[PDB]
Amino acid sequence: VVGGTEAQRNSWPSQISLQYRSGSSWAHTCGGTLIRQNWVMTAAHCVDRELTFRVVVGEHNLNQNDGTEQYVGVQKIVVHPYWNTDDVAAGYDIALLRLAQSVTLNSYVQLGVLPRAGTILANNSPCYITGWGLTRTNGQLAQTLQQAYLPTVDYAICSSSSYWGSTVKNSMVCAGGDGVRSGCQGDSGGPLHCLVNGQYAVHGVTSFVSRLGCNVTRKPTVFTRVSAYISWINNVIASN
């Protein structure tokens, strides 16, 4: 997250760190949202590859065990079947991960609340992006979880020629684009949290930015719109 600040520890208890096997250790690559005791929602591009993954819930500092963390393997990966790696702007950047053991829910580990099917946010809706992604160009992953205020840009504005034009689809959420705050490398798969009807709901799954750079004016960070996938999410979990 570029232009953000360190989150209060465990203040976003559905946020997960998605890590791939390295030697006998583990390395962060993407975010995710805990949506069941044994399921995580992430980006397709994070897991459409032959790696061994684990998920960390209750995480804040990536290189220090503070006591709220639980480390669980990934049992099953279900990439959206329409996802195309050569065309992120086509959409369908979503995947579900079943965990090899259920996590224990507590004050630090909570399910992300999802929007009702079809929900579209009004322009300039207040949202927050979180993650351990880069905080500067050519930086390292953040040590501690970061957040940034990232208000939505509606489909009409985001699809204009000065913004994203035809690149953005109605199945996506645009947020930010002020040239100060944005997602960056390592933030993919994570939530865009939006306060709607009195609770923070996860309306977005972090997907992409302009090739110009993470933080670019009129190139908002682009998220998969969770509300467009509620039936798909529920059916995969009921079946798998």
Binding site: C30, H45, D86, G133, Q185, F208, R211, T221
Partner: protein
Amino acid sequence: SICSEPKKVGRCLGYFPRFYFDSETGKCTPFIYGGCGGNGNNFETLHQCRAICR
């Protein structure tokens, strides 16, 4: 071939450490790949890169 292809990070916001063969410099070199839309000058391992074009 592929070693002559440009370094390409892509649009996605993943954090995937990879290697590419650098032209202005002349050596296989680390970079952060975003996780989608990669091209040919993108190797999961430094040993792949060298064997592949070096």
